[PDB]
Scaffold this active site. Structure first.
Site, mmCIF file in Angstrom:
data_model
loop_
_atom_site.group_PDB
_atom_site.id
_atom_site.type_symbol
_atom_site.label_atom_id
_atom_site.label_comp_id
_atom_site.label_asym_id
_atom_site.label_seq_id
_atom_site.Cartn_x
_atom_site.Cartn_y
_atom_site.Cartn_z
ATOM 1 N N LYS C 37 16.835 7.074 10.294
ATOM 2 C CA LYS C 37 17.099 8.518 10.372
ATOM 3 C C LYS C 37 16.004 9.446 10.893
ATOM 4 O O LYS C 37 16.307 10.387 11.596
ATOM 5 C CB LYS C 37 17.557 9.060 9.034
ATOM 6 C CG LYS C 37 16.839 8.549 7.800
ATOM 7 C CD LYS C 37 17.412 9.269 6.565
ATOM 8 C CE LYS C 37 16.450 9.275 5.378
ATOM 9 N NZ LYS C 37 15.244 10.103 5.646
ATOM 10 N N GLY C 119 22.351 6.057 8.447
ATOM 11 C CA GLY C 119 23.306 4.981 8.408
ATOM 12 C C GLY C 119 24.040 4.985 7.100
ATOM 13 O O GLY C 119 23.426 5.182 6.068
ATOM 14 N N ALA C 186 -2.372 10.082 -13.197
ATOM 15 C CA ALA C 186 -3.530 9.326 -12.695
ATOM 16 C C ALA C 186 -3.187 7.884 -12.249
ATOM 17 O O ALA C 186 -3.919 6.907 -12.563
ATOM 18 C CB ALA C 186 -4.667 9.321 -13.709
ATOM 19 N N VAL C 243 2.067 17.427 -19.290
ATOM 20 C CA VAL C 243 2.224 18.746 -18.710
ATOM 21 C C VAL C 243 3.564 19.205 -19.185
ATOM 22 O O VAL C 243 4.501 18.439 -19.077
ATOM 23 C CB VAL C 243 2.043 18.774 -17.157
ATOM 24 C CG1 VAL C 243 2.326 17.460 -16.574
ATOM 25 C CG2 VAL C 243 2.911 19.863 -16.503
ATOM 26 N N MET C 326 6.115 -1.549 -5.954
ATOM 27 C CA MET C 326 6.505 -0.780 -4.767
ATOM 28 C C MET C 326 5.312 -0.716 -3.864
ATOM 29 O O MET C 326 4.577 0.272 -3.888
ATOM 30 C CB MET C 326 6.928 0.636 -5.096
ATOM 31 C CG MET C 326 8.038 0.753 -6.137
ATOM 32 S SD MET C 326 8.818 2.371 -5.982
ATOM 33 C CE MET C 326 7.829 3.281 -7.517
ATOM 34 N N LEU C 327 5.112 -1.763 -3.079
ATOM 35 C CA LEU C 327 3.962 -1.888 -2.241
ATOM 36 C C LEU C 327 4.391 -2.278 -0.838
ATOM 37 O O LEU C 327 5.426 -2.937 -0.648
ATOM 38 C CB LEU C 327 3.113 -3.007 -2.792
ATOM 39 C CG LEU C 327 2.289 -2.832 -4.041
ATOM 40 C CD1 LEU C 327 1.868 -4.242 -4.499
ATOM 41 C CD2 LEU C 327 1.092 -1.927 -3.779
ATOM 42 N N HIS C 452 -24.092 -15.964 3.397
ATOM 43 C CA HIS C 452 -25.075 -15.056 2.774
ATOM 44 C C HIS C 452 -25.689 -14.145 3.844
ATOM 45 O O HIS C 452 -25.795 -14.547 5.008
ATOM 46 C CB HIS C 452 -26.149 -15.873 2.078
ATOM 47 C CG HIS C 452 -27.130 -15.041 1.352
ATOM 48 N ND1 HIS C 452 -27.320 -15.138 -0.013
ATOM 49 C CD2 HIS C 452 -27.960 -14.068 1.789
ATOM 50 C CE1 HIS C 452 -28.232 -14.255 -0.387
ATOM 51 N NE2 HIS C 452 -28.633 -13.592 0.688
#
Ligand SMILES: Cc1cc2nc3c(=O)[nH]c(=O)nc-3n(C[C@H](O)[C@H](O)[C@H](O)COP(=O)(O)OP(=O)(O)OC[C@H]3O[C@@H](n4cnc5c(N)ncnc54)[C@H](O)[C@@H]3O)c2cc1C
Ligand SMILES: Cc1cc2nc3c(=O)[nH]c(=O)nc-3n(C[C@H](O)[C@H](O)[C@H](O)COP(=O)(O)OP(=O)(O)OC[C@H]3O[C@@H](n4cnc5c(N)ncnc54)[C@H](O)[C@@H]3O)c2cc1C
Lengths: 44, 474, 474
Positions: C37, C119, C186, C243, C326-327, C452
């Site tokens: 879209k 769609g 957070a 909050v 959700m990655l 190293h």
């Protein structure tokens, strides 16, 4: 005990490694390892 | 002299090989002593090699960023950007000073005994350590481990004064940035160091006898792309070229005399500093080996067998002074292993899985075989490549140099070599290393979930390319 | 023109995993069609997410260095360090634009048919795309694959206008550094975005219902340490607070009412900008799922089986419209193996090996299980840690923040979780993941030879400590 690919490709061919044996580093069942299980099916 | 000391393991030299072997020997319950001739520990890695030149490239890198187009083009804008070389240098030293303190501290923690002085084998179970005020200390020991490391291979005919003509260690302390500057040798050491002063404002030209940049065992393809990238930054190279001699003159300038390695296009470059970076050799001076009947390699190294044993069984040698790559991690490894061996354990080391890294920017790191070694060997392979211009993390940071080249065996798809030219190559090459010790296949590594978006993902995409024939993003 | 087409797979969305499955499918030889879209491709990751936010975390980090003590202590002295937000924002748009360009281009070389429009699944074998202007486009397809992504979770009685009360989107396009900023939540997105503006001059406080910063699955001890650090940088947090609402004042400011989650010690916080990010939710509207008898699950995700099929066998859902982290890297893999399964093969993915990464600085990254996942599973473990303070490359780089912590199964040394707080974490966890997929044990990592000096050595040292009682450098 199974390299990612080894395992993935056993699955795709509806079989496991209880049959064929291990090889390669930390006794991890190799993809080389699995392919041989793979070719033994056809051959067979 | 005074009162003879008693030891299981006496380690000669305190660099990377020596100080871990000593601590490991300690961790295992050995009355260990470690002798080092110098004031501070850490051997050459820490005091005049690795750590300094790294601390220096890191700093020199940010400078070019801040002075160049990078910063202004990403919103950060400075009035002028001057360089305070003494402040820069001080940074490096604070790091070194801090680390060297650590090693000493690591020794107390493990009850390692640090003897200071120029040690030397005076028995099949004894070494004499002599301070320059004539003081002396004798250790009566069960095994002796040698880690005397290396030194600069000097260039015959050109005398290093460490002022206008320098080696690695003088180039790390330049009191000012030279205008022009030549580097005999384009190995990891030379290239790195040249890059530092280049980045800082020096016009730098390296001269190499061979036909490529980077050391030995580097892939010729990534070597050439690598060279090409440096050429863009301002670095100039004069490959397949030998020096006849170089001459100091009235006004200070140095005049090096170049000529084709084969033919002869005699030319003359004229610089303000001349870094000589032609190699580094093992160091055994006055150890007392001639007298114990220990012959050297024709390249100055100590012939040690599989368990790291010299001709005299209780006397081992490891690190720069023994065969294999002259790397720090490489020495640490032989160090540990050799000791675990005295301990009665197995000593396997796989020299194929020892990563090599050049830390310029972009970095170059590789592990396993290169294409040329795989041909010379007769091995049927395939290659997959993924450039960083296509890597998201990379594109997002506007740093898109290089590619990752994977070599997989054509039939078993076993990874035979991984080579990364680009950002984050030094840390990437360890993931590779791992996969390689596993006999990974390009398929295996491709089915591993690499997090997005990372530099790493291009390491994944290059195996995806080598085992299926093409990747998704490229 | 607006006339039927057909395909083997039609994919809805061109986010990660949507377009990667599209490409993959095409390369296995399905005639594929990807409908999207928006005006550009890439999904949220590339347009308003991952990429854009990485562009700012990276740019604002180079600010915090040039405009603070870092550069100064490296000997890079600078007159004035002025910020030009327009231009820093102008390099981020750059990245994104270039990247989304790339996708359009990949879709062309893999011959993937691009359909622009919203769609709807009009039938088990039909999708109907509706363009901006009613213009319609029908697709008769063998399989349809749902990857419609996720959207912002909105906050009870507060409305994002994306101007002064913004969500992640708005946040990435602020027009000046807001004097005071408040962040609701957070989690990852949270500390990430808060940290960008806190580095650019803003005053950010982050209020969070839970007792720990960083999202779900983050390890308690590294969360506490992560918090501690971000605090010293200036990032202010309000944990176990809730909050209760916000009110938009007359002069332009915003007033948030906060309060103890537990009881209710009420209090107000004024601020110029509110960033609302308490979460994301699966986005699935106008898809026609209802009239098809696919129910959603209570969190709103599409319940799919092992091959990613819904209740309707030829209709698959992958990405973050279905269960699991959700990655973006999780979307991409389900995209890949979903199509591979439609093409006959094996469809297994092990969600215990997908990494997590917070791209603040210090970085935070993990893979496998946390101390508390293990503890509530009745699994016995042992722990191994190494501070970057004792790492050579971090010390040399004046970057020593953090530690690596690996968890190994008591008796079988088998690695169970790896957790990294420190420089290079994001890349380092990829090594981790490779080690997990191989069912590697602590010792296996400890044997591998890491170059190293590198951060990765921390990762080796921590395993060694988990396996054998103690490491070498600590
Ligand atoms: C410029 C430069 C950059 C480098 N960069 C890298 C890099 O990035 N990565 C990498 O892996 N390697 C790098 N190296 C190489 C690396 O330093 C070596 O592999 C490593 O130093 C070898 O360690 P070692 O323990 O073998 O010996 P050394 O570090 O050479 O230590 C030997 C020690 O023994 C002392 N010694 C010698 N003889 C005696 C004696 N008879 N009695 C008492 N003490 C003695 C010396 O004083 C010294 O302390 C670099 C080298 C240079 C100089
Ligand atoms: C601020 C921020 C930072 C983030 N950082 C990271 C990070 O660092 N690492 C990480 O792994 N993840 C990160 N993420 C999360 C990551 O973006 C998601 O995991 C990923 O975007 C999900 O990809 P996807 O393919 O599931 O869906 P999406 O990216 O959400 O894509 C869905 C796509 O489908 C389109 N669409 C939806 N419905 C329809 C429809 N009906 N018809 C046509 N098109 C439709 C949408 O327009 C969109 O293109 C971040 C997210 C945010 C916003």
């Amino acid at each position: 005990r199974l390299s990612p690919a080894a395992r993935n490709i056993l699955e795709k061919h509806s079989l496991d490694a209880s049959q064929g044996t291990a090889t390669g580093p930390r006794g991890i069942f190799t993809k080389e390892d699995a392919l041989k299980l793979v070719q033994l099916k056809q051959t067979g | 002299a005074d009162q003879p000391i008693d030891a299981d393991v006496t380690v000669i030299g305190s660099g990377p090989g020596g100080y871990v072997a000593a601590i490991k020997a300690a961790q295992l319950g050995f009355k260990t002593v470690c002798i080092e001739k110098n004031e501070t520990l850490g051997g050459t890695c820490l005091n005049v090699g690795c750590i300094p030149s790294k601390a220096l490239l890191n700093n020199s890198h940010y400078y070019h960023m801040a002075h160049g187009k990078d910063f202004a083009s990403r919103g950060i804008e400075m009035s002028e950007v001057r360089l305070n070389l003494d402040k820069m240098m001080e940074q490096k030293s604070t790091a070194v000073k801090a680390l060297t303190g650590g090693i000493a501290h690591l020794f107390k923690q493990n009850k390692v005994v640090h003897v200071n002085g120029y040690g030397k084998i005076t028995g099949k179970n004894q070494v004499t350590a002599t301070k320059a005020d004539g003081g002396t200390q004798v250790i009566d020991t069960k095994n002796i481990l040698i880690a005397t490391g290396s030194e600069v291979t000097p260039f015959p005919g050109i005398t290093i004064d460490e002022d206008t003509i320098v080696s690695s260690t003088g180039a790390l302390s330049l009191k000012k940035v030279p205008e022009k500057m030549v580097v005999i040798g384009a190995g990891v050491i030379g290239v790195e160091l040249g890059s530092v002063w280049q980045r800082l404002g020096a016009d730098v030209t390296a001269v190499e006898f061979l036909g490529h940049v980077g050391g030995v065992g580097i892939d010729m393809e990534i070597s050439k792309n690598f060279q090409r990238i440096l050429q863009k930054q301002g670095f100039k190279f004069k490959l397949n070229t030998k020096v006849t001699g170089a001459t100091k003159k009235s006004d200070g300038k140095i005049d090096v005399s170049i000529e084709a390695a084969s033919g002869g296009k005699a030319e003359v470059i004229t610089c303000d500093v001349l870094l000589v970076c032609i190699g580094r050799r093992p160091f055994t001076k006055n150890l007392g080996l001639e007298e114990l009947g220990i012959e050297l390699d024709p390249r100055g190294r100590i012939p040690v067998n599989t368990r790291f044993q010299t001709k005299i069984p209780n006397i081992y040698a490891i690190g720069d002074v023994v065969a294999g790559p002259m790397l720090a991690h490489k020495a640490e490894d032989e160090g540990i292993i050799c000791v675990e061996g005295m301990a009665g354990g197995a000593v396997h080391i796989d020299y194929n899985c020892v990563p090599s890294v050049i830390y310029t920017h972009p970095e170059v790191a590789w592990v396993g075989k290169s294409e040329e070694q795989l041909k010379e060997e007769g091995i049927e392979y395939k290659v997959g490549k993924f450039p960083f211009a296509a890597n998201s993390r990379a594109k997002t940071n506007a740093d898109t140099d290089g590619m990752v080249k994977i070599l997989g065996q054509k039939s078993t798809d076993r990874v035979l070599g991984a080579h990364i030219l680009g950002p984050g190559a030094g840390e990437m090459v360890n993931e590779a290393a791992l996969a390689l010790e596993y006999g990974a296949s390009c398929e295996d590594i491709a089915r591993v979930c690499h997090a997005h978006p990372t530099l790493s993902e291009a390491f994944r995409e290059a195996n995806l390319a080598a085992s299926f024939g093409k990747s998704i993003n490229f």
